[PDB]
Amino acid sequence: VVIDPSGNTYYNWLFCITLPVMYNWTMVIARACFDELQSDYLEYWLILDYVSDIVYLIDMFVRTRTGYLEQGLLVKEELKLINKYKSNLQFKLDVLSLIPTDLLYFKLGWNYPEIRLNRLLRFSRMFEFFQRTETRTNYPNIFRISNLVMYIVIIIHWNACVFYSISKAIGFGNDTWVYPDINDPEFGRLARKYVYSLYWSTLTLTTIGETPPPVRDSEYVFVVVDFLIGVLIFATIVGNIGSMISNMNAARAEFQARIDAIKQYMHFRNVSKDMEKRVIKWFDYLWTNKKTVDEKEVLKYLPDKLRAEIAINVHLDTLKKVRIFADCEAGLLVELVLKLQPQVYSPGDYICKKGDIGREMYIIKEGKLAVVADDGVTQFVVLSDGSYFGEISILNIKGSKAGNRRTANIKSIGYSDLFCLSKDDLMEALTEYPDAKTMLEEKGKQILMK
Amino acid sequence: VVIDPSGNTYYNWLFCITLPVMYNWTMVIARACFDELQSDYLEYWLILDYVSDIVYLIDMFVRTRTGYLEQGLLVKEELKLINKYKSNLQFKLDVLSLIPTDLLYFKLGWNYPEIRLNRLLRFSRMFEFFQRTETRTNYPNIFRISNLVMYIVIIIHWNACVFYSISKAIGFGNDTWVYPDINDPEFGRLARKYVYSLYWSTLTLTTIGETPPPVRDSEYVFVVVDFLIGVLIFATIVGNIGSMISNMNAARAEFQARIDAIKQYMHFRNVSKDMEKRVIKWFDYLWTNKKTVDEKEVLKYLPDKLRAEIAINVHLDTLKKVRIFADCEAGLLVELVLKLQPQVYSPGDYICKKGDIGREMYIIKEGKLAVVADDGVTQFVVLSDGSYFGEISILNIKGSKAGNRRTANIKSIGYSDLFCLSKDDLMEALTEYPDAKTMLEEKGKQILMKDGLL
Amino acid sequence: VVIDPSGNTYYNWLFCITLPVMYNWTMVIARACFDELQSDYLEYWLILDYVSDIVYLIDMFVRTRTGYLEQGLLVKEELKLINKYKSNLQFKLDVLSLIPTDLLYFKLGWNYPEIRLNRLLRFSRMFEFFQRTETRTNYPNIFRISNLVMYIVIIIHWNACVFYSISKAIGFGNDTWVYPDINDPEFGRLARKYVYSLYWSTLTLTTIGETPPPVRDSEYVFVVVDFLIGVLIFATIVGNIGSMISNMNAARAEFQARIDAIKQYMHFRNVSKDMEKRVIKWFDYLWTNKKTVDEKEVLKYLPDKLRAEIAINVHLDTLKKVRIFADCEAGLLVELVLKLQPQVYSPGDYICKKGDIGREMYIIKEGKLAVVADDGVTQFVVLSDGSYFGEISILNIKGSKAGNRRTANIKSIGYSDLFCLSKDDLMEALTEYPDAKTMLEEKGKQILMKDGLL
Amino acid sequence: PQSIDPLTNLMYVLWLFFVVMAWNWNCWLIPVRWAFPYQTPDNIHHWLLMDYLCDLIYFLDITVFQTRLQFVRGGDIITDKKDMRNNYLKSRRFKMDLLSLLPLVNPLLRLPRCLKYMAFFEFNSRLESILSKAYVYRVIRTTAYLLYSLHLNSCLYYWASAYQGLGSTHWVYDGVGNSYIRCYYFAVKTLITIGGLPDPKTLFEIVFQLLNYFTGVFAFSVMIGQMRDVVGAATAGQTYYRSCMDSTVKYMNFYKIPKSVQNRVKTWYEYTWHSQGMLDESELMVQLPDKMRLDLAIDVNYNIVSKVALFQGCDRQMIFDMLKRLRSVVYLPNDYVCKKGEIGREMYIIQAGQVQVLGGPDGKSVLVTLKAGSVFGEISLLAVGGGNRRTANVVAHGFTNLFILDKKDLNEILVHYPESQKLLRKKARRML
């Protein structure tokens, strides 16, 4: 059995290994620095350390059963997976992350959990889990701000532990900058110790200050360096939030730039005000109903296989409905779908006029069209969704008395979405289908003569 | 000998000249403002300044021996390099940097290292080395953080020296804003002097405040100007880091915008759920395996000659194994390589179906392709990388039994990445090779006769 | 006489009107809030205000004599310019900025110079001068920074005046928040008054605090509102500087993104190490020599006439030296120059090999090309700037023994900037010149007969 | 008004303003009445009266105004009363309006009324279209978001002060002053991370101050990040124009182009940017719908192209192809539009400016000045292979924008219209 890295099981295990890494990256340093935290809950820390070590062994077992993708196929051979795991640097980090440094507990004592700082080397699993999460998640921005908050909180927690350790090394309460005397009942509480250390670290790492000034030279040096780190952290927070803000309304900014450009164009070109209102209403409708970006530009980032398959899933069923293409080969209709060009219209727009040359065949997708009588007040018939016209004009039938000319004016009732198949595209698709072209000409001749 | 400016020796010398430039820029003002730093370690500063001036002289020699690029060729004529160096502002700046002002130690005094402030005019070497590292290192973002941090550190150090010198001019301990009396056991130490000045500068330039409020009008004015400068510095830090952050996820922002546009299209068109899931899986595969950017627009950035070289190095060996192209001219093969189009298929995708029209030749760059039967589950032969099919369909041979049709179903077993050569591209390449076109027609005809076709 | 708004005289008058506008925007509120400043230098303020009013009248006169572009013509009719000025809101603002309020000095006294606050309505001249200095300067980022800093300084000065006025209204020394008692020998000085007010305003408008807390509810309201204005100011500063940093790094960001994309493509396609190093060296050459721009993308916006003039000034002197184009018509030369495409070659690159298809003519702008034998070790002749080859291959003379094929190997000794002219582009230029096409074919025939290659 | 259009109506956006200020009353004042003791028996009836006014505004909204909103289904404009009422009930807006009025004198019982925020987002969308230069409202809306975050912070601080006890410690609010602007001041110092406040002593105060400062760090980053995006978006066009103009100046400096040519390029860039706000109008037109692009080209050029004698009787669709192939070219003052004796291959339509035709002895005599809306050079489109040569010098009399259609693009759109191709070719041979 092998685990697909792109599957849901690998992501579910990535969460299950992220918890011991987060426990080690946050609480090992807290127990190393805050001695009361390590001493009071020692049995719970032993249980959690043993559980995290077990999960680390299982994680090393998972990487021996995680397939890598060569020649487009997932590798299921056990020896290839073992050698791929052992060849990378990750195996060395995983082995170093599980070196039995806990044997020093019987040498140094039960108050030295910094021997488990090698367990921090499994950070790659945490980073891989977060990089997979920022792909899978429905909300990239919410997870991005949550991840930034988590990283800032972890750094603040580490700096709080560092500040408490520096206060311990200097001595609690010897000066006003260090943490005060822990023999005081208020200051001696472990919750008070950690919360005030986190408060100091949050203050210093976010360019707030609001802390007692340093007294000794080492305290001044540490405060200067940690304020510089805090400037970096605050600038990172502001830059991440600003990049998030820019990415969140990037499409809105692009659409607003486009509509401002078209407003400037119709103001400069002395375009009539009714046309200006029509263009502004059209753009507002396109943004409101989520059709702002061109279909050609959207789908060109897809491969040719998926673009054709998506187009087949959209247009093929309607193309079969067209009378001329009803008997066509299933292979031929694939190219005709791929040559369909989207066309959008406004209320009152004329798709075609009577006496115009018909070079396209329009397929109505999400609109209603009217066959007006050169006045715009009466309609022969209203063409609903799935209808079509110009299917005979694209074909070339000799003897057509009204051939190559539109027989009536087609008027869009309102905001119609069409798909045209031009005569040139049909001919270049039929160049590879001679028999189909002849039978289309025969069927069009039959339609014209009936 | 002439040093190539784009080589590694030039970068190594850029580091070797940046070290004394950074030493001067960080320590001349420190010794000028903190007099005890200058007086206590004066011998060490003497050897360090002498070594820095020696390295400055060797830098001027390297500038005389640094070749520029004329007519695309490195200039190696010595007198031309001398004239090019002396015709630039950098020669004047280097001469001003190495003006001997250590002779003014006898006049002004040994406690006046302000005379060595002209050595700060070699800043162009430091910036040049930083730009070369930025365009050279494999960690542009980490190096940009390091460079911004070092700039902020040197600016804070300069402002610390300025604050200490202002306190010295006003009077040590005269009021509460200045550095306190330097006769104190604690604040009289040079280490304490520098680190408290650095702390005050760090608070002020990072717009944190929490420094003793000014007393005198000059102190108030300097504090106003220096918090304004600190606001500008903080805004510069935030702008640099935010620009870097936007650059580091510009590719992700663009890819997510593309995926959002595709999803909006699929919801607009009421595309079926399985098709949407397939598209999402394909884009996840693209992001995971670093195949997001399309190859055509990536190769547009290359020049035509260099893109042709890349295409040759990728495709010529696998195109020379095609039986029709076994013995062809080099130019025709290069053009046909340039006409290749990448096609990537998901597992289970059908490259060709039986009855589909064949107008392309597909060459498997990587992946496994199956010649599957009509049932869709039994395969005839697995085609590995480097293999090809459709070499006959691109050739237009009269009288062929199978005309522009696919004889068997071709199915992608896995994530197959392969290149297609269309019939139209082959004809357009063969327009300038008519003899090669005739040879290709003859080879296709003889292949069809050998196989029993035609 | 009519002043052209795009000329240097209009910019000079914009500078000449900006100084009274800046003086009114700063020192009028400075004298209104600080009564000592108004009373002590009253004669100087009267002289400066009279001078500023005179300059305002001359500014209105210039506005009546400043032309505007109607149908591309600068209007020089006096009545049309006067009517265009009067129909604009700027005339109303200029009238309201020069309503005589100095007559109210006899009613309110010399202590009230805030009656001249209507002179602030000439802010449009200051903004126009700065927005025209932004375009005219060669350092847009430096001037952008200077403009932002001086706007922030003006707002800080205004808030300092407002804080001093609020302290005056509440009472000097009434509580710990206001400015102290002005009967103090230290705090009663005008310089100390303004400088401490500026200190308070700088600390509050930069969200730094470090000021005595408000005591009264009105003081709390003003402090809250003015830190909110400071939040807006700080956000504007950091946003403008970050946009500046992103705009300056935009070319670096996109070039590095292109390099990263090409490297990712190389890791995809398993490109050989020497080819990868060649491309990396090419991109380092492009960034180091400031050649990353694409000429087509640079000149795509320009019209045909201006792009034609630029291309002529670059290439006509070397195109007229081509032996086939010596007698060509000037318009055909313009078309051929406009159809020249730049190509840059690395050292050792083969521009064309012997037996390769000759598709384009190459003209050397910069660099050296060597005609080499089949091995490439020996060189026949070195081609320099202005030299060319392939002039007969584009002609495609009938009966040619070469047969549209290259007869020699051209190798780039160094980095050569060539400009290719394809046969398709030559025919596209010649389709309007059939007589010149016949003359070109005749000249190619004469060349191929003198050499005996027909 | 039986049925109103939400996208266009101004009475509807005024009603949206009223609904926003009714919803702003609930959002801003419910935490005030929850935290501050401003909701006393002596003034409870004013609070209840304004709450009833806001609820009546909500009720009038959901009953009258939302039920008569015309909508778009399948592209059609639906106006009848039956469908508009039924469509709104099926939307998310009616679902949120029902839960924004449920009863649930505690001010926290009115917290459902804060859930009518879809009216605010709908009101925001109108202000991004009704008024030009919409980044000004974005700064105001972001500032209002900051003012509300400090407002909630002010209510949270007073609750924390009162819960511990007023004036109990130095960190809590003591009790003097307005009690709102005092606690709002603490929010301003805290949420902007300004500091200067009394230090928190008790564990509850330190935890509250820690989170508040942490929240402020991200809140102050949102304000900067929003302004950074506003500044970048407002100056994006100017930055692109400056980068494009500087690229050509850098290009012209590399090839040692003289300043006579360079100043002409600088003049064109300055004139084109200050006239049309663009550098290429066709880059915008390719992003438009094909019907939008064609209708704009008809609204600009069809009243002129349909008046020239050369294309009379031609196909109307072929003329429509001519308008789409027309490109706007700006000629500098005294620039030669046509040289006497060069190849004539273009048709010029004067959209703006004056064009002078030279002649007489030694040229430089204005035979005629062609104003905007006139077409010259149409005969050149009918020649084949350089058959047309300009018979007179033609110069631009100061910053003329010409719509140019060349012979190559006309011939490309003349192969799709064989009927007009025969007629236009017949008119060519009928005059020579």
Ligand SMILES: Nc1ncnc2c1ncn2[C@@H]1O[C@@H]2COP(=O)(O)O[C@H]2[C@H]1O
């Ligand atoms: N009286 C009618 N009834 C139904 N359809 C019509 C009528 N008149 C025109 N049409 C359709 O409108 C189209 C417009 O011109 P076509 O030649 O494309 O083909 C026409 C028919 O499809």
Ligand SMILES: Nc1ncnc2c1ncn2[C@@H]1O[C@@H]2COP(=O)(O)O[C@H]2[C@H]1O
């Ligand atoms: N049995 C088979 N063994 C190997 N290759 C095959 C087999 N059947 C079909 N092919 C290849 O698959 C191709 C599909 O259609 P073509 O006509 O392009 O030419 C075909 C051959 O190249």
Ligand SMILES: Nc1ncnc2c1ncn2[C@@H]1O[C@@H]2COP(=O)(O)O[C@H]2[C@H]1O
């Ligand atoms: N001995 C030579 N001296 C100068 N130019 C040459 C020599 N040999 C070849 N060339 C040029 O190099 C070109 C390469 O192939 P072409 O056929 O394009 O035409 C050739 C000539 O223009």
Ligand SMILES: Nc1ncnc2c1ncn2[C@@H]1O[C@@H]2COP(=O)(O)O[C@H]2[C@H]1O
């Ligand atoms: N006297 C004139 N009056 C009006 N138009 C003219 C005059 N002289 C030249 N033109 C126009 O200017 C054009 C310039 O050269 P063309 O050959 O294109 O055709 C010319 C006419 O259209």
